[PDB]
Paper text:
Riboswitches are gene regulatory elements that are frequently found in the 5′-untranslated regions of bacterial mRNAs (1–6). Although the cofactor is ubiquitous, this riboswitch appears to be rather rare and has the special feature of a tandem aptamer architecture. Here, we report crystal structures of the first, as well as the second domain of the NAD+ riboswitch, both individually bound to NAD+.
Therefore, they were replaced with GAAA tetra-loops, and in case of domain 1, additionally, with the U1A protein-binding loop in one of the constructs. In co-crystallization with the U1A protein, the crystal structure of the NAD+ riboswitch domain 1 (from Acidobacterium capsulatum ATCC 51196; in the following named 17delU1A-D1/NAD+) was obtained at a resolution of 2.80 Å. The space group was P6122, in which each asymmetric unit contained one molecule. Therefore, it is not surprising that 17delU1A-D1/NAD+ folds into a similar pseudoknot scaffold as 18GAAA-D1/NAD+, and C12 and C13 from J1 form the characteristic long-distance base-paring interaction with G43 and G45 from J2. In contrast to 18GAAA-D1/NAD+, the 17delU1A-D1/NAD+ dimer involves both junctional regions J1 and J2 in contacts between the individual units. Clearly, under the conditions used, both RNAs existed as monomers in solution without any indication for dimer formation.
Numbering used by the authors: 102 to 193
RNA sequence: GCGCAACAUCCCCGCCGGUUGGGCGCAUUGCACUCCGCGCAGUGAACCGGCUGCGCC
């Protein structure tokens, strides 16, 4: 789960929030500490309430669990965690 | 073929299916990298398959 290091995985999000509003209301919050490459969100039955954001490299992504970890985001605390594997765009 | 919905407890809304998006509810704490859980309804939204009826060649 936690404690490898590739990118962030945010959990326990408000699923009522639509995809577009969520994808941008995180980029505006998660670039205070790094540059964002791509943010990914799905409202499917599994990946709803979860997000996948990747930055420049690894400690361009350690700079996230860094900050938030229970941020009252849309009336529910965040829970961030390092992505177990790596996103298929950084494998190049 | 073209244009329409009279019939409607103000107006608007012919019928049956369906799609996309919006709403509410149930369920979901879930590690992905093209979409996709389900239910409810005057969804005063846009459309797709048909059909009934009215008017005009
Ligand atoms: N004050 C306002 O701002 C306001 C608001 C709404 C309407 N209006 C006016 O009030 C008027 C009321 O008109 P309406 O809505 O009663 O008529 P309509 O114009 O809606 O209906 C005419 C059509 O009904 C169809 N039709 C008639 N009998 C039929 C039957 N037996 N079977 C199937 N189809 C049939 C025909 O195709 C006909 O062309 C309108 O002309 C409108 O201009 C005014
Ligand atoms: N101009 C015109 N063409 C028609 C009319 N009715 C049928 N047609 C022609 O017929 C074709 C088939 O349409 P349909 O609705 O299946 O014809 P239909 O079933 O005989 O029509 P009904 O008489 O109502 O039963 C259309 O493409 C038209 O060209 C009409 O009233 N006016
Ligand atoms: Mg009409
Ligand atoms: Mg009318
Ligand atoms: Mg009427
Ligand atoms: Mg009615
Ligand atoms: Mg219908
Ligand atoms: Mg729906
Ligand atoms: Mg819904
Ligand atoms: Mg149609």
């Amino acid at each position: 789960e936690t404690r490898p290091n590739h990118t962030i995985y945010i959990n326990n999000l408000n699923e009522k929030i639509k995809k577009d509003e969520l994808k941008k209301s995180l980029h505006a919050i998660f670039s205070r500490f790094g540059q964002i490459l791509d943010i990914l969100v799905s409202r499917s039955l599994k990946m709803r309430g979860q997000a996948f954001v990747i930055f420049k490299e690894v400690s361009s992504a350690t700079n996230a669990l860094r900050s938030m970890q229970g941020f009252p985001f849309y009336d529910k605390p965040m829970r961030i965690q390092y992505a177990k594997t790596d996103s298929d765009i950084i494998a190049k």
